[PDB]
Amino acid sequence: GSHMCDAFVGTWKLVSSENFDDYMKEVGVGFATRKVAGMAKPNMIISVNGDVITIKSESTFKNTEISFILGQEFDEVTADDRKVKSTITLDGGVLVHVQKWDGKSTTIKRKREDDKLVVECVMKGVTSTRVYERA
Ligand SMILES: O=C(O)c1cc(Oc2ccccc2)c(OCC(F)(F)F)nc1C(F)(F)F
Numbered sequence: 001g002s003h004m005c006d007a008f009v010g011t012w013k014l015v016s017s018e019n020f021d022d023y024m025k026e027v028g029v030g031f032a033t034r035k036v037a038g039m040a041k042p043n044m045i046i047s048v049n050g051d052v053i054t055i056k057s058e059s060t061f062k063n064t065e066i067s068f069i070l071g072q073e074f075d076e077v078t079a080d081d082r083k084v085k086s087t088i089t090l091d092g093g094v095l096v097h098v099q100k101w102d103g104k105s106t107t108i109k110r111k112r113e114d115d116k117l118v119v120e121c122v123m124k125g126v127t128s129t130r131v132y133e134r135a
């Protein structure tokens with residue numbers, strides 16, 4: 001039945017963001033996409049069915065969805081429209097998501113902290129923190 005990844009399951013809404021514009025600059029997102037993406041207030045819906053985890057993000061800007069098995073690489077289309085190769089693992093209760101494309105890498109960590117789901121994104125020393133709460 002239960003799995004430790006079950007504390008991520010649910011419907012989550014973005015409540016705060018820090019330095020996301022600069023993170024997007026470092027990833028290579030252009031001006032217009034940064035402005036519109038930075039405005040959005042996505043909801044993230046996280047579900048598990050057997051070994052498959054699904055993370056859906058719905059917003060006024062873009063909708064994105066990934067389904068994956070921990071430790072098994074997959075192809076992802078990001079919200080900013082990169083085509084990346086991704087691997088997601090669980091390390092000490094933290095979901096660690098690495099995206100690789102064009103010789104570049106970014107890492108997105110998702111952790112449960114109190115009643116929050118905290119998303120920490122890093123690229124070449126630039127970090128952003130985005131905090132989600134239950135919807
Ligand atoms: O989960 C996040 O909030 C999040 C959201 C992203 O894009 C959006 C933004 C607004 C609405 C819908 C999707 C995003 O896009 C990749 C980017 F940032 F490179 F553009 N990356 C992340 C994250 F890095 F942190 F995972």
